[PDB]
Amino acid sequence: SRCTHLENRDFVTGTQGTTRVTLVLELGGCVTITAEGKPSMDVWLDAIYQENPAKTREYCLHAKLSDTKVAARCPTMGPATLAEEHQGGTVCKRDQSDRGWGNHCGLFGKGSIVACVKAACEAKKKATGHVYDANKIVYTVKVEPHTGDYVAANETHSGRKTASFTVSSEKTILTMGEYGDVSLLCRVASGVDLAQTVILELDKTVEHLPTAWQVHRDWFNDLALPWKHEGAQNWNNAERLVEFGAPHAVKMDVYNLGDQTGVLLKALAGVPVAHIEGTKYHLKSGHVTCEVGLEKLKMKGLTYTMCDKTKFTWKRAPTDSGHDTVVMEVTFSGTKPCRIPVRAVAHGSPDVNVAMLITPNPTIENNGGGFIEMQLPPGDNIIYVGELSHQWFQKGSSIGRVFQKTKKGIERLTVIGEHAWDFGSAGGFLSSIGKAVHTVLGGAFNSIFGGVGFLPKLLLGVALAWLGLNMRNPTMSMSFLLAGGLVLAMTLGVGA
Amino acid sequence: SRCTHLENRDFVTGTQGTTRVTLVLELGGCVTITAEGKPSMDVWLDAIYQENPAKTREYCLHAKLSDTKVAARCPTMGPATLAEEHQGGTVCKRDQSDRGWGNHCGLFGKGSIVACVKAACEAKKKATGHVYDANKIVYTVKVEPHTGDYVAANETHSGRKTASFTVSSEKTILTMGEYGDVSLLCRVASGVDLAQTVILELDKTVEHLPTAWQVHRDWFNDLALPWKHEGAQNWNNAERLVEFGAPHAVKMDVYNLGDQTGVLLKALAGVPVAHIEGTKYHLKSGHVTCEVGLEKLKMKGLTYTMCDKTKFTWKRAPTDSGHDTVVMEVTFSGTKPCRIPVRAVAHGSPDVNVAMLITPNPTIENNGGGFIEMQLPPGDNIIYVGELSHQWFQKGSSIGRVFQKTKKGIERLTVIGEHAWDFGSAGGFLSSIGKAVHTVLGGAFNSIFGGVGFLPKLLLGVALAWLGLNMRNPTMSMSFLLAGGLVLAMTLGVGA
Amino acid sequence: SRCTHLENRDFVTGTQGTTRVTLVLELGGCVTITAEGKPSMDVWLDAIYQENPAKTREYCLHAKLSDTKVAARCPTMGPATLAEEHQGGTVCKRDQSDRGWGNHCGLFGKGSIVACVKAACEAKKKATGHVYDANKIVYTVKVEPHTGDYVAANETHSGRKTASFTVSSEKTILTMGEYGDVSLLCRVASGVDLAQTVILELDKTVEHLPTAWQVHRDWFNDLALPWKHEGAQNWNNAERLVEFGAPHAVKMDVYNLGDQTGVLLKALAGVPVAHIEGTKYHLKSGHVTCEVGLEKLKMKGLTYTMCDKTKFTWKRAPTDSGHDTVVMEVTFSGTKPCRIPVRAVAHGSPDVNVAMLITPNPTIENNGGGFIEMQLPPGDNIIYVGELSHQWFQKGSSIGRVFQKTKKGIERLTVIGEHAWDFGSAGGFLSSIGKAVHTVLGGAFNSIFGGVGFLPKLLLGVALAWLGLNMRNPTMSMSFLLAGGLVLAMTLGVGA
Amino acid sequence: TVRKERDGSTVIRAEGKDAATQVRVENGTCVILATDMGSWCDDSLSYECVTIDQGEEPVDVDCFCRNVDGVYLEYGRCGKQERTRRSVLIPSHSLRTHLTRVEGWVWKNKLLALAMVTVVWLTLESVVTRVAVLVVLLCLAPVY
Amino acid sequence: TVRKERDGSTVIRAEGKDAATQVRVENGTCVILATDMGSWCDDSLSYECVTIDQGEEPVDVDCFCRNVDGVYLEYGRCGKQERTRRSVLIPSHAQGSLRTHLTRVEGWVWKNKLLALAMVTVVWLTLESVVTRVAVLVVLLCLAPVY
Amino acid sequence: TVRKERDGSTVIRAEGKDAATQVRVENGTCVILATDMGSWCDDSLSYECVTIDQGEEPVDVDCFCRNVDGVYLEYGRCGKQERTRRSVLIPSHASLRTHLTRVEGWVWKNKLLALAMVTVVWLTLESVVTRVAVLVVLLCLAPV
Ligand SMILES: *[C@@H]1O[C@H](CO)[C@@H](O)[C@H](O)[C@H]1NC(C)=O
Ligand SMILES: *[C@@H]1O[C@H](CO)[C@@H](O)[C@H](O)[C@H]1NC(C)=O
Ligand SMILES: *[C@@H]1O[C@H](CO)[C@@H](O)[C@H](O)[C@H]1NC(C)=O
């Protein structure tokens, strides 16, 4: 049960009639899944990485000058030239010179002087930029079977399984050890504005300093420095790192503007530090939606003798979880595999089993334990494990349970995004909207009930539909709409 | 009676019913106090000082230049530098130099020259600005027992006591030698807009010239000269006292802008000369209001034999004081301690004691004197000192005194400022306003009377109230308000 | 016809009954005069110049300092003097010298130093200015008889004549070679705001750069530099180009502020480049309003037999002129002087002469040819020259012709300026306005016609006037005004 | 050292130890006055060394020669601490929000909000219609 | 007088008694021209003395040395009556009635024509007693300057 | 060099090559200290070279003579590249259709006020020609 200690967990109870269910995975969240007669599961979204990102621009810095040449001619000799005004990877300037009688020239006018320099960047000083590719991102999803013999802490778990999803990927299946198979027909979407961001990397190869940043494409494309495409050898616009001095008679020094790494880092101060591992480049925003097939999966520990030895002690006390659930740690002393007889009671009544149960059929074997989880109804309640009994009180209201479940259903439907509507066929449009709405209403369809069984609910839906057709005042006509909604939901039957 | 030599003496006769009384102390003013059976007392406000005013800015003049260095280089070698371009307390300038053939440069371009100079201020030429703080000012209150052995000059009194009041101060008690204890609760309000002014001091250490000035903070903050705050070491804006000559070949003379004490004195002429003594800085505006507790005093010499030997002569003629009273200085010949038998007569009437008396029970001792002071009613009056008698006449009219007392009372309530009113409780609201109003009317409540005495005065107030309840035209309904005011005044009983 | 390649030609057919006609000329325009029995002419206004303009302020640049002298004396010896302080053409300064013990002085006080420098402008660098004089301007008018032997190039025409006009001039006559006499009574008006513009000439003596600027008088007179009137020899305000440094003990360097031609051109870029030719000074806007006396002149070639040899071919094709006319160059083969037979046809109708003819009675002579021009009514038309004939379609509509001539008449009246109004007498006021109105309406008076002739036109105007005097609805009283307008136009007879 | 090129032109190269020294070139002489010499490396700088006719003096040239033609000077700028530095300028780097914007406009335009609410409440008759008109009016108010 | 520093830069110092004299540094010769010198003190100035080859002539410098290198001159500026004095202009401090308030009131009336006419016509229309109107208008005008 | 004037005062003139040299002036000796000298031309300058008794030290002077009287030094400021330059400030030099354009602009700009005026006159007055004449005048007077 790894997700018991995150700050953003949510539940989905699926449906009794059919095992198929849908989920939304957001970075840092978790979606525990439950079934009427199948053991529970869990899901993750830990990393959104890309391997070998493509390269766009490669800015240089600390340009290295070499083999500078300057030449000039007297007035009326025609402008001078050097062979380097047309070679690849060079920078040149033209200006007049104040030649006179002291110089070898025969007149007293202004001549011409030209200078040229080759400009190749030093190695290990280039700031390369990379761009993601939505059609190649890799999404990571993890699932943890509810063995429950774990303290529920921060350390890793044994028996966990994983899978990877990419836009091209469509089908996948996992084994979950002896538990059984579960399928993930999934769909994925990129985080917002991929094209707006480019990753800048210095390649400095240093251990005690940051070696990557993430910034907007617009500012990056506008930086005033030398740049190149990959595979080229001549640097474009090198004239930004070279400043030429005033023109003397026959000399014009070409000053190197020096390294600028410090200025780039100061301007890049406060930008989020990028995350890089091996050839993987990570991201920190995303949406994944999958359909979980729970058809082939089966439960464990139903063939055990179910000992009534009644020898148990509490490893920990009932502590209120951070998300409307009860955590309980128990240790046995029977020295044998066995089911844990558990009873929930309210109002001190002889009647039992008045609480919903996760970690279905908690048991013991030659080794392991129990991290049994309980979801008691609000108020005074009694937890029984074997011969031991403890008193615990749960805050909140049943109305609150329905309100929060509907609010999270609407919030999840909001998060599914623009993928929740298909206009190809009218039947598909209606079926998709109707299923999404029934996913939203699932929590409210099983709020408070008691009586004969499941079948009478359909009859009550028909009675509600007939009552809406009593030909009464319009202000109380909502019963017809409610009856129709309940009648479609009867095909699922999630409340009795 | 030292306050007989000021132009603002004010009187306060207190109340017979309770001895608590209030005053207003304004610089140069006085408040002589009298009671029905307690020896008179006086009060001053001679000085308002603060000790060790805080420092705000330390203006420099006449900067001391030291260790000037200049260095330069030929064109095509890059601008030069000096180690003093980054230390604390150095001014530098940069310019080009017209290097040529005489200089060692082979190029006819423009070179670079930099000159740096250390700039710290000479001693004894720092103009410092100090600013007061309201929550620490000290107010001096002086009280002079009214012994009456004094010639009334320019000299300090022997037997006088003093005390100090600060916002935090609560109560104080002065013993007054043989007379008795007096309690002075007091309140303080600084002069208007203290934070508007900054005291400037030159530390010039001269005896015959001004050494302090008072000016606005807005003019001070804009004076163009070097400045620092205390706890600093590198002067700011030091370049305001150094002018750099034209960049010459490889030198830049750094001229010293010179002393500027003369410039500041001329621009600061006529400003009021602030007064300083030791570590104390005075002021020339402020309000002090004290409550005098006249509870514990006893009167002097009520047990002396009161010799009827009838032997005295005048030391000063009966003269018209500048404050509605007749001064009298007398010298005895009875050679023993003795009261001065005195009578006041008007219209040659056989009835006596028709004048109010200050210097309560004027007496003689082994050594001292009699400065008996009188407040005669206007008209024909004859003063008797033992057997001796002199003719005297008093100007003005009793009605004039009523007008004057009322005007001074309203002037005092105007002076108390925004602290004449209390808003915390309704009981306090009426107590404060009612007390202030009766302080104003007290002067008129004891103007002229004749008949039975005190008790019928309450009956007169009741009759006025009843007359004001005649249900006639509203224009003449003020008799009820006047009656109500008089009924409250009966609680004091300052005139029978 | 020199005006066949400008962009501003216009037609004025004058009056059949009377010979005098009026015109308006603007730089770059043209006007072609025509009559029923007199050959055509042309008119130009190609230059508006003045010769030898008056001079106003001869500014200077780059003062040439010469023979400077400096002198000084020790304190207590009377300020020194130089002879150059009283002569003309000298700038001098006076100040104090910080003399001391090193110098020969016996005291340590302040002395006196004076310096003077003889100031004159280097040759070939003075910027002079000139001011126009409206009473002296000369306006040139030309006329090109329409001989018709020209292919319409940019070259001068064989037979062109010229006349000069100035406000003082009254009458003039030209001979037109064998054609005859023409009278040009004329009045002139200067361009707007002459006194607001002054011309600046640099005397730089360069043939490939600007050498004359036209600028506002206020700015020129306010320019800060040395200046003088003509004929003088000592520059006023010469101190604006000389600066004196701080005085040493016995020397005061007198710097020359140097040339300022470069800043003057940079501050003067974006001002119109004046046009100058030799001793003349041109302008760029002006009117010339005249009366052309076309009475004594005669037509050419009325004696030739008009050879029916029928030997003609097209030297040039019928080209669509830029001003609503058809151009035509014909080549003869008759080997003798002869008339050119001309006809105009439309729709293949039997009738001819359905076109107005410019270059009246075109002929062949010993040397030349024929540049015959036509203006056909809009629509289908066929031009016949001897045995040959070509088809042509003319653009526009008859209503368009009328509106365009009326719009040009109104525009011409607008161009006549504020001189179209005469206040000398009421009869003259009315006559001038009425004749100006008929000058505007002459083009519309001959729009579309067919019938008997001139006399019935008067009968039509009479019938229209009679109809207007029926005392019918006042809103439809325009009939009387229309009849009067037509009847007044009958005096000119511009269309039968 | 002195070298001859393939076009008949001479070239002279010197280390940091030839500051202000005479070097014999072919049939004449050359002088080096450059003050930024050093060892030889790829960061070399070279230029023509003009020759001045005998009887003249140099003007604005760090090297000159007498009685020689076509002299080129080339050297390197290494072995000493580094050069006209000037760094290149580079600039530094829903429903609830709309509801908040609406309320902010309402509070800054309280008079006009009072006018629109009173007129709609006074004119419209059905209560549900009054409320719906207010909702639409508020949503449209700040954005246009 | 001469001195050798620890970084090879020889230094020459003179008092005000050495103008136009020859001084010996290392092997060659030095010339001092500066004439604003005096005794030594803290107000010391030091600068390079460019070395010039024989046959050259000084141009714009106040010292030079031949057949020597890295010579820095230094001297003081004390011992002479005093220097380009330019006193800093500073503003002189400023020394700091019913008719004045009446003047402020009439000025306010001349400038606030619209509001003044509005209040005056409103009180004229609303109050129907001349004595009450005159008294309230006098008080309103007296108080107008405070707002 | 040296020369004698007819007033009995000797004059000394020297080119740019006589800085810091001793020159023999009649009986005594003279020194030239200035270093901003140059060749001789019309742009000349001259001054009283003070004379100092031996034992005194020249102060703030650039010329001095010993055991001589009345010596004037003159020299020229030409032959070298040019100088306290301060370029002087001189400022940079600068119908019915126009009225129609102003009214077109006013109409397309102040649409509300034009509509109000047009509608007020249109509603107040009845005859079309009278409405048109009044509106034409109002639009013409729109510039205020
Ligand atoms: C947190 O978990 C990691 C593995 O996920 C483990 O190495 C670490 O020891 C854990 N921290 C603690 C306090 O147990
Ligand atoms: C003030 O007091 C002193 C000391 O008692 C006395 O000498 C002097 O005469 C008095 N008067 C004046 C005007 O100083
Ligand atoms: C312009 O006129 C000249 C007159 O000599 C002539 O030579 C030239 O051919 C003309 N230009 C053109 C384009 O024909």
Author numbering:
A (entry chain C), B (entry chain A), C (entry chain B): 1 to 496
D (entry chain c): 1 to 82, 85 to 95, 112 to 162
E (entry chain a): 1 to 82, 85 to 98, 112 to 162
F (entry chain b): 1 to 82, 85 to 96, 112 to 161
Recite the paper's sentences.
The E-DII harboring the fusion loops join at the top of the prM3E3 spike and are capped by pr peptides, each of which binds to its respective E through an interface with a cumulative buried area of ~4700 Å2. The third prME dimer joins from a side via a ~160-Å2 interface between its E protein and E from another dimer and a ~320-Å2 interface between its pr and E of another dimer.
The envelope of immature TBEV particle contains 180 copies of each M protein precursor (prM) and E forming heterodimers. The prM protein stabilizes E, preventing premature virus activation and its fusion at low pH with the membranes of the trans-Golgi network (TGN).
